[PDB]
Ligand binder design. Structure first.
Ligand code: BO2
Ligand code: MG
Ligand code: MG
Ligand code: MG
Lengths: 212, 222, 240, 195, 204, 235, 233, 231, 244
């Protein structure tokens, strides 16, 4: 798995891969690793999990209940902490998940929270989680700036997943992009890696190692 | 030490058509190197035009199906005989499975039916409740033999159009119920040849707007 | 456990135990709340039947629930401590999970909910307490003032009074408080609060307590001399 | 392997704490503040097992803040440290203990004295002139043994602290991405933004 | 791993003529690392003295617990607890945690206020009472202390002679133990005066 | 004294019948169901002019497709709303769909008779539960503390209920528009209210399939009050 | 979790045209020790069902009491207890199957493999298997333990599929069972010569045969077998 | 009088007044009729409305594919009892793969209602039920009273003015019992029976509620234009 | 059932009073008078034993003045048995606080805890309240010398001088008259005894009918000493002040 999320001028980019494996067996190439929690909050998945389907769908119910009770959109900090406090109760019980709770509110601005099955909860600008995280970090760190256009930022996220999808055996399938403003998240296409690779290779002049 | 789990073998397959859906599964039940039954039904009609199969450990599989059938019944009581939609059934099953997260139903669950727009729908689950709608899914022992074939022959993966040489893909033309059954039968005939836990018989349940229909085919008994 | 249904309906559709809890509030010392343009003031009566008291250590009528919210009350003193403690815990619990202090509305809603629960729980009687909860929401300069009562109903008030002779001071506030133009400054708001208490209190010596709450956790309690200056100024203008 | 350090000087307590957060193979963050303000004149730094650390620190924080509101009074550093120790001493015999080591640096406004307390996850409290948790002490204590005086100024304490961090940066295998330094004195708690 | 030797430390107690002496080192460590040279292991409740070796968190916890219990004892009984009675209280308290014990080696010492009789006692971690006439030893250098005490001790020593004996018993035992030392304290206890002496010893 | 769950010689539960008397004392609430939507309206009834009337929350959102108005001991409604909101969201979690308005109402009404010697007494509040679902369309339910719920085309509860219900008897027809219904609620509220009806002491709300449940602004309601006055003066 | 102590070996069974046959030897083994030679492991319930049990004997005796108690309970307030509302094989099986699965789910299994053979109200043959894991399956032939490996192959030569059931008479079916029991005696080291056999026929009802013995055994050829290869004498 | 304060108290003549007051709640409730033949069993219920704007309170509840009841009295109590029946019918299926006998279903209701009449604090159920079903011993009709008394009958009626329908059935006993293999004629007899309990009001399309179960007929409810055939 | 015999101890009167609290206070009004007087340099606790006998062993007797810890003491007015239940609870709370924070419990915190316990019996549980009123005399380093009182309602208040039990109206008037803020312990001792001497229902005030105690900083350097007066010491202070 490779999932990333980074803050920038235009809000937040979220990019994930699509592969799920059971050992060396490729189970699915079509996995949605972004739970659309509500219209304003996004959550990612990684780690031999899908525990996070249940719990981030559950989180969406808690966030809905919050804004019914408080007549106000839940903060990214409050939403992330409901999840982190929940998984902390279950600490010790099972396997290894990792997530990024992403959102944009008035009081906070664009915010990303790395929540973890060990109970860790970190606010930050850039995060990469999954077996292919190191590959994604490489592309992201060298090309990241705050002053990135929405177009360029989307591409960087797409390219960072592609980099990991290529090298990491347990990442691949396709890239799901999301862009987050406070008006809501915006979906930006499902991009097959099989087609995206040859497209990027040719246009960018990258991947000269590979023959095409 | 007592081991509460077991492998009853078998293999299942769900394919979603344009206005139909099929859920197939072999009728062989096994432990280790012995055959328990040559005909032990594995795919069940659960009502509301939904078919289900929980392949793997038969005791957990039979328990889960039983509990879902029960869930359908109580859905009718509690909500004025409302028809349980396939998407709602899928989410309900997630909660049944995850309800035993720390002592799982050791099964690979697949349900098939029609969505609320009338189009074919197949949902696939893991043992701990994660699910996803899919056009094509094989589950169980011989899933590794069947899925690559389905990627090739249903979704036309790695296939391109002659003359263009890799430039233009093969178009994703829809498959008829007769065409799907041919792929199902060939999948199980091939799986039977190379997997010892697959054989005896193949039972297919076809779901259309008209209802649920059954088809049975012999498989090699060795 | 003791399960007896103490709060129950009567033929005429009344829960007498809730209504008798209001009678306990009627007996309690007067408490008043007035919100200005950029502040809220909480006035409280101290009955002068009790002298030889130690005012340093005697429980003050106004209680801080958090650094930005305060709670005064009329009714049974012992009962108020139970509501205050619960409210203070919930305030810290809210900060811990939501990572943001309670709104004055939320804190009020919680306290009111506790009070309500005691009107239909077995083996318990209702709280003989009405509260005035005041403060400023986090990162907000709009003043907030809420009232609660034993039944569990709550609501917001431009100005409000509870306790003994609250009918009289509510009469005063209703004619003297203008919504279109509330007390612009701290002085004007405190003055109006003291004036309203002087309709009931008796002597303006140690019988009036005033607590001024301002935005951004700026809460201060006025001393005897500071209050006595308001009392002097009010009566000197009155002699005309 | 997080490094958290503490030094009590004449009129203040200084707590240094690493900025790195490592989740296995990658450094996920290089600007993490491993501390919580328990009260205006009491600061607790912490290091231990992921999740447990913050969960514990915030739980303690909430309790001290609850006490402060109830009594309208700030607890002494000694009192807070004793409370914290009891929580960890209670924790160690629980089903799942808090795996958290802490330093509590506070300025006692009554006695007008800085106070540094070192408490490990077992609930082992010690009042010290300078303290550390984990492998941090192994490098730093030899420097602190040599250079430390009880009458040092805050600026002298920071210089001695720099010498400790430099030695850690030289000889420790893990890159801890520098430290966030905080000073606790009569005027409260402030952060040294340049270090 | 072994809780009783993580922090390290020692306590020794002796009887003399109309007096008792109890002594301890000052080290607290995290295995090899020395953490504190001011960790005193001898506490007192009225005229009853209690030394505690072993896991430091439990040393602290038990001191706080026996302070708690002896204070309530005093309020109700309207008198200070005696060494014989306290010994029983320690044993009771320890045994109630039979299958989840405090990892400690307590040592009671003191003089009975009424009879004037010198008293010492030692315990294992689960409450067994060792009420010796001559001496009690506890901690990571207990073997060493046993060797010193068994050779150096003689009965009916005067307070100022007893001090020299117990001091040398502790010091030389602590120097043959890696996890003990870093200073030492000796309490000389008489019926109505108690002298506390800090010893100068090697700091390694 | 006497049991809480005691039957009268007539065959009624004393405590349930006494709670109905408490609801008669409560402020008026009116609900009207149409094919274009359901309208909910309430009398706020502030006990003093110093009470900020906008804080009086007698109309409440349960979900996006279900709204609720109350009358009687409104403090008792809070736990009923919390349960209703939880029930609505919980069902969405289990079944990935909106919950039927009847099923929601049934879930609320199950609480009603959970009293004995569970809570110590019945609820002292009646609820008008209005909503929409795909199966039965726009619906209005009247939930009582007896555990009984009736569906209605139009319903009035509170102090001016029998007078308003008689007015709803004549005025309601199956071809009412949403705008007509809004005015009809305002008309009947103005008729039964002690004080003069305006945008501050009365509140409107509706539930439509498109926009979901909405509480009306005081500026929006003020225009509907002004529109009402003119159309009554028109003949 | 436990281990089985006193154990019962194979239970074999098959369907035939008018009903079902089930058989099991009368041995209660204590490891390699053939401890108890008079143990009945076929337990009839009513006049239309026979439950055959293998595995732990103490757990068998528990199951035996549950079935005995089931009949008692069914008779309570049931005027049709010996008629329309009498216990069916399907009812008795599903009950056991519920218990077996519940017990495995509490990690405290009844250490058994059970075969419920019987005939339903409508004359249909009932034959279904359940074990310590709660695993259930039905087949024209069912067998437990060694029976699975040796009996089934022989019984499947008679009834290989569903369509062979009406073609199989009670005489042919019983013969196959009795032969299978002999084969198990040759080859199962924890079996006995003595066994019980039960026939549940839709016409002639329940026939329960006790004290049967394996006969017509072939051993004579043993005399000719000498040494393990090269030895002649 | 002095002995009606709670359910735990006998009167001097050996009466349980709280039970009798609960019995009174049934008589206030709307009329409902039950009757059966050898093949089918039918419930006919007169639904009651609050006013013209209101709906008509549902009277019939389904318990299983082969069993269900009609209520008269406190509807929530019927919901509690019907829910219990649903679970018992369901327990029988899941555990024993067996459809619950109608007679045994009555025995379970009897015992559940009884516990409420002998214990302090609680109260009797304030509803009467007519349970119909088709099991292995053919068609059945039961009458449940909240005293605990359950009675198997050919036909009966409960609720207000139910005596008229009950007399009619007592005359028609020999006729309607013979209506085998004809659901419509059996319903006709039930509709004609409930008509004997009507005054002023008559059977309209949204007023009438009919249910039926039989040999090859699952328990199914008919409301609205589905019962216009029988008016 | 059992409802028939339930007194319903935790309910409001129509006037909004707690019946049982009011009646418990009526019980306390018949109890021996206890007085507390706080001075700048210490606190006095004086209390009258109720109609004693010559055969009562006074030197080993304790019905009025109890010690909660080294810094805090209480005077009792009401049922002695009820008071001892609360006293033991209070003693434990002080020790719990000490164990937790390693500091002696602040006086107000201890008072609030006991007062909260009394409050609990007036609101829930269906039990009768404790027929006890306390005078808390104590010291801590925050507020210094403090006097409090609690009653069965669970309400507590701070005082400079206060009486509980019998003739509190008469007693409170006399204290209000002669009390001044700059007063000292020796003067407060005299005031306490003079007040009891005038309000007593006995013919004459004697040593055998009194319990007496002082909390003084009159201890060697910065620390506090509790002095529970012995019978002979009460006799001496009665002669010194000129009452006998
Ligand atoms: B990713 O590789 O971490 C991925 C994320 C998951 C949410 C789909 N995990 C998996 O694919 C895991 C295996 C795994 C591989 C590498 C690292 C960690 C875990 N597989 C599954 O979660 C899985 C497998 N089969 C069916 C369902 N789920
Ligand atoms: Mg790859
Ligand atoms: Mg083979
Ligand atoms: Mg330590």
């Amino acid at each position: 798995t490779t999932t990333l999320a980074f803050r920038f001028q235009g809000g937040i980019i979220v990019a994930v891969d699509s592969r799920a494996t059971a050992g060396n067996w490729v189970a699915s190439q079509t996995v949605k690793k972004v739970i659309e929690i509500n219209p304003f909050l996004l959550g990612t998945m990684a780690g031999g999990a899908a525990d996070f389907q249940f719990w981030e769908t559950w989180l969406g119910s808690q966030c809905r209940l919050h804004e019914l009770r408080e007549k106000e959109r839940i903060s990214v900090a409050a939403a992330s902490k409901i999840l982190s406090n929940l998984v902390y109760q279950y600490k010790g019980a099972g396997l290894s998940m990792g997530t990024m709770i992403c959102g944009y509110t008035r009081k906070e601005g664009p915010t990303i929270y790395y929540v973890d099955s060990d109970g860790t909860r970190l606010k930050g600008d850039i995060f990469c989680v999954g077996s292919g995280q190191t590959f994604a970090y490489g592309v992201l760190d060298s090309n990241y700036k705050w002053d990135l256009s929405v177009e360029d930022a989307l591409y960087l996220g797409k390219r960072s997943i592609l980099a990991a999808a290529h090298r990491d055996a347990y990442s691949g399938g396709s890239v799901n992009l999301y862009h987050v403003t406070e008006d809501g998240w915006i979906y930006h296409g499902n991009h097959d890696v099989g087609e995206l690779f040859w497209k990027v290779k040719e246009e960018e002049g990258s991947f000269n190692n590979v023959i095409g | 030490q007592f081991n509460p789990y077991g492998d009853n073998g078998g293999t299942i397959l769900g394919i979603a058509g344009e206005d139909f859906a099929v859920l197939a599964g072999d009728t062989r039940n096994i432990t280790d190197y012995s055959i328990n039954s040559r005909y032990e039904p594995k795919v069940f009609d659960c009502g509301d035009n939904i078919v289900m199969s929980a392949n793997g450990f038969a005791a957990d599989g039979d328990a889960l199906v039983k509990r879902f059938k029960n869930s359908v019944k109580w859905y009718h009581f509690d909500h004025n005989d409302k028809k349980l939609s396939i998407n709602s059934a899928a989410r309900n099953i997630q909660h049944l499975l995850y309800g035993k997260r720390f002592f799982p139903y050791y099964v690979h669950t697949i349900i098939a039916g029609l969505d609320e727009d009338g189009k074919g729908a197949v949902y696939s689950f893991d043992p701990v409740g994660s699910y996803e709608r899919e056009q094509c899914r094989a589950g169980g022992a011989a899933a590794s033999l069947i899925m690559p074939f389905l990627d090739n022959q249903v979704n036309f993966k790695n296939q391109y159009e002659p003359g263009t040489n890799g430039k233009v893909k093969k178009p994703l033309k829809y498959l008829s119920v007769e065409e799907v059954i041919k792929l199902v039968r060939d999948s199980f005939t091939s799986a039977t040849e190379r997997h010892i836990q697959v054989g005896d018989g193949l039972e297919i349940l076809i779901v259309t707007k008209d209802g649920v229909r059954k088809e049975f085919y012999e498989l090699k008994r060795d | 456990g003791y399960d007896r249904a103490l709060s129950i309906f009567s033929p005429d559709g009344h829960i007498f135990q809730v209504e008798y809890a209001l009678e306990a509030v009627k007996r309690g010392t007067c408490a008043v709340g007035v919100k200005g343009k950029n502040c809220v003031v909480l006035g409280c009566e101290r009955r002068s039947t009790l002298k030889l008291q130690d005012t340093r250590i005697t429980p003050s009528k106004v209680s801080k629930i958090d650094s930005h919210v305060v709670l005064s009350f009329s009714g049974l003193n012992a009962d108020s401590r139970i509501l205050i403690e619960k409210a203070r815990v919930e305030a810290q619990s809210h900060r811990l999970t939501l990572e943001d202090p309670v709104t004055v509305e939320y804190l009020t809603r919680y306290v009111a909910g506790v009070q309500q629960r005691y009107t239909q729980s077995g083996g318990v009687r209702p709280f003989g307490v009405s509260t005035l909860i005041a403060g400023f929401d986090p990162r907000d300069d709009e003043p907030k003032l809420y009232q609660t009562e034993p039944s569990g109903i709550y609501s917001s008030w431009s100005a409000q009074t509870i306790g003994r002779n609250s009918k009289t001071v509510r009469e005063f506030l209703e004619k003297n408080y203008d919504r279109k133009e509330p007390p612009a400054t701290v002085e004007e708001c405190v003055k109006l609060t003291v004036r309203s208490l002087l309709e009931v209190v008796q002597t303006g010596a140690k019988n009036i307590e005033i607590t001024v709450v301002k935005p951004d956790s700026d809460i201060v309690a006025l001393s005897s001399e500071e209050i006595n200056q308001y009392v002097t100024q009010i009566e000197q203008e009155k002699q005309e | 392997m997080d490094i958290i350090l503490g030094i009590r000087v004449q009129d203040s307590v200084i707590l240094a704490s690493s900025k790195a957060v490592t989740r296995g193979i990658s450094v996920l963050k290089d600007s993490d503040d491993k501390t919580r303000q328990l009260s205006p004149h009491t600061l607790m730094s912490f290091a231990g097992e992921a999740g447990d650390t913050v969960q514990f620190a915030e739980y303690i924080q909430a309790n001290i803040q609850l006490y402060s509101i109830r009594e309208d009074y700030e607890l002494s550093p000694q009192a807070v440290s004793s409370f914290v120790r009891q929580e960890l001493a209670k924790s160690i015999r629980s089903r799942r203990p808090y795996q958290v080591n802490v330093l509590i640096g506070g300025y006692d406004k009554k006695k007008n004295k800085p106070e540094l307390y070192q408490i490990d996850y077992l609930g082992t409290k010690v009042e010290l002139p300078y303290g550390a948790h984990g492998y941090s002490g192994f490098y730093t204590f030899s420097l602190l043994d040599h250079h430390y005086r009880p009458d040092m100024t805050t600026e002298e304490g920071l210089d001695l602290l720099k010498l400790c961090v430099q030695e850690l940066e030289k000889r420790m295998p893990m890159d801890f991405k520098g430290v966030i330094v905080k000073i606790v004195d009569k005027d409260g708690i402030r952060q040294v933004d340049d270090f | 791993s072994d809780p009783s030797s993580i922090n390290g430390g020692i306590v020794v107690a002796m009887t003399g003529k109309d007096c008792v002496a109890i002594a301890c080192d000052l080290r607290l460590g995290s295995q090899s690392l020395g953490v504190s040279n001011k960790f005193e292991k001898i506490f007192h409740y009225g005229h009853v003295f209690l030394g505690i070796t072993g896991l430091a968190t439990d040393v602290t916890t038990l001191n706080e617990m026996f302070r708690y219990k002896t204070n309530l004892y005093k309020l109700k009984e309207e008198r200070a607890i005696e060494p014989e009675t306290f010994t029983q209280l320690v044993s009771s308290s320890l045994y109630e945690r039979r299958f989840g014990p405090y990892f400690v080696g307590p040592v009671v010492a003191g003089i009975n206020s009424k009879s004037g009789k010198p008293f010492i006692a030692g315990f294992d971690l689960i409450g067994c009472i060792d009420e010796a006439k001559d001496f009690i030893v506890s901690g990571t250098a207990s073997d060493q202390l046993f060797g010193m005490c068994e050779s150096l001790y003689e009965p009916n020593l005067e307070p100022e002679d007893l001090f020299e004996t117990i001091s040398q018993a502790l010091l030389n035992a602590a120097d043959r133990d890696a996890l003990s030392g870093w200073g030492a304290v000796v309490y000389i206890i008489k019926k109505d005066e108690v002298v506390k002496r800090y010893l100068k010893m090697r700091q390694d | 004294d006497r049991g809480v769950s005691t039957f009268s010689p007539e065959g009624r539960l004393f405590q349930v019948e006494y709670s109905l008397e408490a609801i008669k004392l409560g402020s008026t609430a009116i609900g009207i169901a149409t094919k274009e939507g359901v309208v909910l309206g309430v009398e706020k009834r502030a006990t003093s002019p110093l009470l900020e009337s906008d804080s009086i929350e007698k109309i409440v959102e349960i979900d996006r497709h279900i709204g609720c108005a109350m009358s009687g001991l409104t403090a008792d409604a809070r736990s009923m709303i919390e349960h209703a909101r939880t029930a609505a969201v919980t069902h969405n979690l289990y079944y990935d769909e909106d919950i039927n308005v009847e099923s929601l109402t049934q879930s609320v009404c199950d609480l009603a008779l959970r009293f004995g010697e569970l809570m110590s007494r019945p609820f002292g509040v009646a609820l008008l539960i209005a909503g929409h679902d795909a199966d039965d369309g726009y619906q209005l339910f009247h939930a009582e503390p007896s555990g009984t719920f009736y569906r209605y085309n139009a319903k009035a509860i509170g102090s001016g209920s029998e007078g308003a219900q008689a007015e709803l008897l004549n005025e309601w027809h199956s071809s009412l528009t949403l705008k007509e219904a809004e005015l009809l609620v305002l008309k009947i509220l103005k008729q039964v209210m002690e004080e003069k009806l305006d945008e501050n002491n009365a509140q409107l709300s509706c539930i439509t399939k498109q926009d979901g449940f909405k509480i009306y602004d005081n500026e929006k309601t003020a225009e509907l009050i002004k529109e009402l006055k003119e159309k009554e003066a028109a003949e | 979790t436990q281990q089985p102590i006193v154990t019962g070996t194979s239970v074999i069974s098959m369907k035939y045209d008018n009903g079902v046959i089930i058989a099991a030897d009368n041995l209660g083994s204590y490891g390699s020790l053939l401890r108890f030679n008079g143990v009945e492991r076929l337990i009839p319930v009513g006049d239309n069902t026979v439950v055959g049990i293998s595995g732990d004997i103490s757990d068998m005796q528990h199951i035996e009491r549950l079935l005995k108690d089931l009949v008692t309970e069914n008779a309570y307030d049931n005027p049709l207890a010996d008629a329309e509302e009498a216990l069916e094989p399907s009812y008795i099986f599903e009950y056991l199957a519920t218990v077996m699965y519940q017990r495995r789910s509490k990690m405290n299994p009844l250490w058994n493999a059970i075969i419920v053979a019987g005939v339903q109200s409508n004359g249909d043959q009932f034959l279904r298997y359940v074990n310590l894991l709660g695993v259930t399956y039905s087949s024209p032939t069912l067998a437990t333990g060694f029976g699975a490996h040796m009996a089934n192959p022989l019984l499947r030569k008679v009834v290989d599929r569903e369509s062979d059931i009406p073609k199989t008479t009670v005489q042919v079916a019983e013969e196959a069972i009795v032969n299978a029991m002999r084969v198990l005696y040759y080859r199962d080291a924890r079996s006995s010569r003595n066994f019980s056999l039960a026939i549940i026929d839709k016409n002639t009802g329940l026939t329960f045969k006790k004290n049967l013995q394996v006969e017509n055994m072939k051993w004579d050829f043993a005399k000719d077998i000498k040494g393990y290869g090269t030895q002649k004498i | 009088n002095n002995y009606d304060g709670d359910t735990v108290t006998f009167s001097p003549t050996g009466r349980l007044f709280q039970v009798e007051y609960a019995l009174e709640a049934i008589k206030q409730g709307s009329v409902t009729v039950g009757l059966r033949s050898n093949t089918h069993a039918v419930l006919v219920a007169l639904k009651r409305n609050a006013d013209e704007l209101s709906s008509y309170q549902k009277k019939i509840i389904k318990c299983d594919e082969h069993m269900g009841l009609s209520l008269a009295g406190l509807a929530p109590d019927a919901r509690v009892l019907s829910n219990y029946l649903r679970q018992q019918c369901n327990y029988s299926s899941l555990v024993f793969n067996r459809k619950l006998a109608v007679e045994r279903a009555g025995h379970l209701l009897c015992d559940k209602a009884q516990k409420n009449t002998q214990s302090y604090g609680g109260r009797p159920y304030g509803v009467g039920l007519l349970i119909i079903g088709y099991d292995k011993s053919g068609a059945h009709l039961l009458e449940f009273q909240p005293s605990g008394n359950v009675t198997e009958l050919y036909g009966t009626a409960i609720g207000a003015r139910s005596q008229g329908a009950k007399t009619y059935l007592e005359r028609t006993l020999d006729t309607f019992i013979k209506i085998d293999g004809n659901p419509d004629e059996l319903i006709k007899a039930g509709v004609e029976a409930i008509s004997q309990s009507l005054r002023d009001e008559s059977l309209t399309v949204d007023n009438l509620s009919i249910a039926i179960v039989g040999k090859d007929t699952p328990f199914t409810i008919y409301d609205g234009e589905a019962v216009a055939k029988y008016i | 059932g059992s409802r028939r015999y339930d007194s319903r101890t935790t309910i409001f009167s129509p006037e909004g009073r707690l019946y049982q609290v009011e009646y418990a206070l009526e019980s306390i009004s018949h109890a021996g008078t206890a007085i507390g007087i706080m001075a700048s340099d210490g606190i006095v606790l004086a209390a009258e034993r109720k109609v004693t006998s010559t055969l009562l062993e006074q030197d080993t007797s304790t019905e009025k003045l109890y010690k909660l810890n080294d810094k805090i003491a209480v005077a009792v007015a009401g049922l002695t048995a009820d008071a001892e239940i609360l006293i033991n609870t209070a003693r434990i709370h002080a020790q719990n606080y000490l164990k937790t924070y390693n500091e002696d419990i602040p006086v107000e915190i201890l008072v609030r805890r006991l007062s909260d316990i009394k409050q609990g019996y007036t609101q829930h549980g269906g039990l009768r309240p404790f027929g006890v009123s306390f005078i808390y005399a104590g010291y801590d380093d925050r507020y210094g010398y403090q006097l409090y009182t609690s009653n069965p309602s669970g309400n507590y208040t701070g005082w400079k001088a206060i009486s509980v039990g019998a003739n509190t109206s008469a007693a409170q008037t006399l204290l209000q008259m002669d009390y001044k803020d700059d007063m000292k312990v020796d003067d407060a001792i005299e005031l306490a005894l003079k007040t009891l001497s005038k309000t007593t229902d006995s013919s004459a005030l004697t040593y055998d009918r009194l319990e007496f105690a002082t909390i003084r900083k009159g201890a060697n350097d910065g620390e506090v000493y509790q002095k529970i007066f012995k019978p002979q010491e009460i006799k001496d202070i009665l002669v010194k002040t000129g009452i006998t």
